[PDB]
RNA sequence: GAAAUUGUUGAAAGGGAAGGGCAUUUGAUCAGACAGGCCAGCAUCAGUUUUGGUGGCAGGAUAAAUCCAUAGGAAUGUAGCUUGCCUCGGUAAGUAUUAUAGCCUGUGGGAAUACUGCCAGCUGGGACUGAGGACUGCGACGUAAGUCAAGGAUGCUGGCAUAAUGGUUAUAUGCCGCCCGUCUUGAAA
RNA sequence: AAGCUCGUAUCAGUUUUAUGAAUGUAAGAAUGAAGAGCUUUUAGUGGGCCAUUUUUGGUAAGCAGAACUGGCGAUGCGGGAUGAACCGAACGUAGAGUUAAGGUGCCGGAAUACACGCUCAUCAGACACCACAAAAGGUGUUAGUUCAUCUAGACAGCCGGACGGUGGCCAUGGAAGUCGGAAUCCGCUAAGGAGUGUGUAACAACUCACCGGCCGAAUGAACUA
RNA sequence: GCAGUCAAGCGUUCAUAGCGACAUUGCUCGGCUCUUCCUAUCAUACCGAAGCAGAAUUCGGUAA
RNA sequence: UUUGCUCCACACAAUAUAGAUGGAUACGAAUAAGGCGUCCUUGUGGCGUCGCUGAACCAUAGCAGGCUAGCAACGGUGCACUUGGCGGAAAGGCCUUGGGUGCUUGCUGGCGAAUUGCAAUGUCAUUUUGCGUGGGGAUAAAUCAUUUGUAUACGACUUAGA
């Protein structure tokens, strides 16, 4: 389960160069090690730096702002493969960014065989309005009130034996 | 619970089915397999049969009368799918085994007897809707056996004989479950309504 | 039908190692095919 | 994409009812009855106003939903095969030797003896399905005519009546001679 | 995947968009200012060499067909979107087919023109045609029940499969020529076709079907008004 | 119950009060079959064994009950 | 008058090996103490450990939320209003910023709680262990004398007193277990 | 093993800093250790096989030479079903707790756990630097990417037009778009090619590519996983 | 097989650092006897294509 | 065979148990569906209700269950006699007709329990027997030896003979 993490780095102040850019960017991680450690795999390469250049400034919990409302997300993928890295956009309704890009790292796992090491998270958004939802299965949901059956459910056994002969009714 | 165990091999799933009869042996619980035929495996037809036929194909090559012996009766057809699910060589395997009886169809005093089914067992749970399984019946006809016909005629009026003993049953029930609701509202009555009963 | 011989899914030590010898092999190359 | 609802229009006329229960549809009507079990579709129907019925598959795959399409087409075949009816008519051709059908009963079976076709001792035997009545036509020569109430029975028979007559180890260009479905349609014409 | 292929072709001519419906927008309203009257034809269906006979008879007046939604949105729709004062008047009355046609000439000699203007053509679905006829029952012929057959040759035995397969009509071949042995009638006077009842008729060449061209609407540039006029 | 979409949670219990679901399903089989086996759970010994008797009067005048019709 | 090897008698085992090790049942057989021994139960203790219940705090956006007050918006559009054509009033296509549903965003307010971390916080259940043998030491409580969980178990209670412990032994059962010696070689063979 | 010193500041398969053209020195740097040096003499020992990392040569492909490094060898035990080199692992005799690698359907000790997905295999798959047959084929299925159309009406579907110069020139018995040889042009439109196939000896007739008419929301192509 | 002609893409950007599939164009120890098994089947069985008039046949499929 | 052998009753020894210690509590079918109750046009029928676990249901209070005094109702149950009908898939059991017969905790009384000393399974099940009892019942074959030859290495087989 994730967590979301402000890591900020700017490398080391030496002399003649004093306060440099402080390098901000939200980071999806487990706890907070892992967090400061994907930065630093980050800052790698977006620049030429290194770990024992800079400095972890602030590593600050993101909470999501309204944990109760259903959003529909989109973010904005790209990952190493079998062959060369590339983008890929997925459409994720859900109520939180740390549960979104859950969904999603379990759905990159999945579909395209990517551990964690490969998926590098470019942006999450908000959409806003619907009908600019542009994928199909989550403009599914999307529709005028929405009421639809779970056929065929399963009946969880706490023991071996049963006297009823199961009624998969719902 | 019970001395017995008297399962209804029915609409199950021969693995998960021997798996959880096995173990419940190896334990000590007696058990008696029945309506074996009407058992279900998983997958299309020929799929299975061309398994078997596969199995059926392996003989001691010199002398064909000591290698495996390839049983038909869906009963041993489901014997060697929990055997080889016991370390059967064994003497708490033999001592095992014993307490198992499988039985094509449903003899006495089984018929008259409750008949319990294993959920984690249950094609139509276990299985996902529109995914085709291969009845027992079938497969085992369609490489040996030759009972299939007569059980059912035998089955079709064994159940008939169920089904009036039934009647009569849920009349009984009826009569019953009508003097209590006119014994309800009596002091006593009233009283175990609050001690749920 | 006769049905017909069905391969095994058990390999063998021989072929399991020897997997792990050809496997190192195409590394060796890999690293020096990557220079060129 | 995994749909969340599909579903069909099975539009019913005035002269037939449809009746439902788990998967067996009643088709009851003019001409007379038809019977379908569907118990391997997994479906689910949806009686809107008695004119119009709603086949419904929740949660299907592409296969699935293959096969939700399929009922509304069978249920179809079975309100038009009691409202109208299917006439399948066979024009027999032959070169040389005259092709001599009949209708016998020999037991009770009904079925079609193909005498003489291109010149064989053979005696052809169809068997004739329950619901599928044969008469040949009137003032045009070489034709059996084929009709009853389900599209199964009449194409079938329709299938085996030109099966029976295969041109064997000959030509297909220089022998001509079988039995051939010259017309696929319906009883009542409107 | 286990989708429908599209029969893949090699052949010259290629689609047109927006491109040419542009074009046709921008050619419209540009003939509006130009020509006095414009004349909204329903001419149900044509023959080409019969467009090409109307364009050779006055090389003047300009007429320019094609989509109905082409010209609706060229002329105006509604009170808000048209090009001219009271201009959509005649595209709510337009209705099925393409025509349109630009004049700078009198009214009375355009709906004269029309009025006297009658071709024989094919006859069509969902229209009566005004014969019965019937294919003799012998050999049938190219011509087919319309001249003595002494002057006529018998028809091309390739195309004895359409007439068995696609117009239903009961044939068979017998040294080299197309033979019935009942005479089949097809159509009936004064009653409604069907699809196939027209093809008979169109591969027998019969062609007993009278064509008037008609207009239903009329503009006037000056006048800022709308006429309609029913001939047909 | 009529809950627009989207509620927060004083819309909800504003609804959820006015329909009175709770006393809705208070009243079904359901919620009374789940109190049931709560109410044998939390069971005394003593409390128990008045089961015991109660049934056994209760079955006495349940059997002159029956054997008449 | 040994062993190899054999006979008889008594016990036991034995479905394509046997003998061997760990542990126990079963059968056979045996040793003391009884000139304080064998086995146990409970309580309060100490060491190691396992498993619950409950309290206090502290951290972060001094959680984020929810909830409340205020200001704007659009909707998968809310009541209303207009309109189409019908089974009487349903639906449909516009308006209508919530009116007789609600939602979103923004600003402010006062809280709770999750998660994370600490307590030399309290309170239960379970297991294995009791080594040492007058006193010294370090401590705690007590007004002091004295007491104590503080330099390793005592107190109380019961059955048996022999085959009941246990051992030896034959077998059964679960699991493990290549045939030794030599000689080669990098090894096995 | 024995004697004699110092039991010490005698040092270390280690890091740092500095000096230098993964190895070289020094340290009043770090960290670690009480087993240090010097004589005297006394057993055994003087093979290698496997693997990892550097590096030079090689070829259908394997590979071949050094260096350094582990492992086995003189080493039991847990696991990898099985085992020379694979994963774990500081072997006195016992008790208790916790774990490693590997696992938790039953054989088999331990969840037929939970959660999101993907797959149906006419002998699936459980397999492993993802290495060999391996580049592909497939109207299996799920995700993508890049260009396209689309309420001036998308795809599909039938209904119609699908034209005159013109039977363009040579060809030749007969070749009118459709046996073939070369350009392959004009006009008229809404759009129609010196013609997409079927067809006739030659034509005709049909077909589609191109439009247009009802039909009313999505659809199309090329790639990647 | 060698050399060239195309040429999906990839080359660290990318066709002018280069590799490049199917085609294509260049001339040129042996043998006697038995048992069992495999199909990659010569015949027998059933099919599909073929100027397959019939007969005969050629190729191909299932098939031990 | 000196009543040898079997079957009922109670009686004592032995011998064991892959392992009783309230009850193996009987519709069938479907699962994208069912069960039950009621009603009617008697049907693939309308209406009501149920599941979402057997967490049930039935049995269950007495010196390991003794002895007695009653009260209420025609019930429940045990035991053995008994009228049939039913059960062939391993039927070996299922219902039913009755008479007797104890017991009933449906409700209320009166006695008795201890010392098994603060726990020690505290023995109450069901097989296979043997020796004794007191009643019923039933009156053999096989092998060898001889012969046979449809059989035959020897076995075995087929025969024949009071």
Known sequence: HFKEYQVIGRRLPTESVPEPKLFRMRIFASNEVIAKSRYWYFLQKLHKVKKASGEIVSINQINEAHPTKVKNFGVWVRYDSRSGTHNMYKEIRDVSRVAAVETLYQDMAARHRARFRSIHILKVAEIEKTADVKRQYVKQFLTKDLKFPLPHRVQKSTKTFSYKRPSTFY | ?197 | MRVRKRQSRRTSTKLKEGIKKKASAHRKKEKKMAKK | MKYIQTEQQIEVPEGVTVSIKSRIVKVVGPRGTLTKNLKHIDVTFTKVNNQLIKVAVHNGGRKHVAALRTVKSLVDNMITGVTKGYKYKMRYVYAHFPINVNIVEKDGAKFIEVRNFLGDKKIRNVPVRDGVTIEFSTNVKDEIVLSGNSVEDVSQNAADLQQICRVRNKDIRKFLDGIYVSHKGFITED | RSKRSKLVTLAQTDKKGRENKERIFDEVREALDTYRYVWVLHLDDVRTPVLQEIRTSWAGSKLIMGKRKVLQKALGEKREEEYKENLYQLSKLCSGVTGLLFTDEDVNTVKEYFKSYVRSDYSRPNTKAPLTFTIPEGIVYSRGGQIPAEEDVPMIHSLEPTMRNKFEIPTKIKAGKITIDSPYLVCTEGEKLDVRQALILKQFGIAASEFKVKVSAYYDNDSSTVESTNIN | FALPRGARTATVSKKWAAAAVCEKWAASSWAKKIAQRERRAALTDFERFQVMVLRKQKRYTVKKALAKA
């Open chain 2, 1 to 197: 619970v019970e001395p017995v165990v008297v399962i209804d091999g029915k609409g199950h799933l021969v693995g998960r089915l021997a798996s959880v009869v096995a173990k419940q042996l190896l334990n000590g619980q007696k058990i008696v397999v029945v309506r074996a035929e009407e058992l279900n495996i998983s997958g299309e037809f020929f799929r299975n049969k061309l398994k078997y036929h596969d199995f059926l194909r392996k003989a001691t090559a010199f002398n064909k009368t000591r290698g495996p012996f390839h049983f038909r009766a869906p009963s041993r057809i489901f014997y060697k799918a929990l055997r080889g699910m016991v370390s059967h060589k064994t003497a708490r395997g033999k001592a095992a085994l014993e307490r198992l009886k499988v039985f094509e169809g449903i003899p006495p005093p089984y018929d008259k007897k409750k008949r319990v089914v294993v959920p984690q067992a249950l094609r139509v749970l276990r299985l996902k809707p529109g995914r085709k399984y291969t009845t027992l019946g079938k497969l085992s006809t369609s490489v040996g056996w030759k009972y299939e016909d007569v059980v059912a005629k035998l089955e079709a009026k064994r159940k008939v004989s169920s089904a009036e003993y039934y009647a009569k049953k849920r009349a009984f029930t009826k009569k019953v479950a009508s003097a209590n609701a006119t014994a309800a509202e009596s002091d006593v009555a009233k009283q175990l309504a609050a001690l749920g009963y």
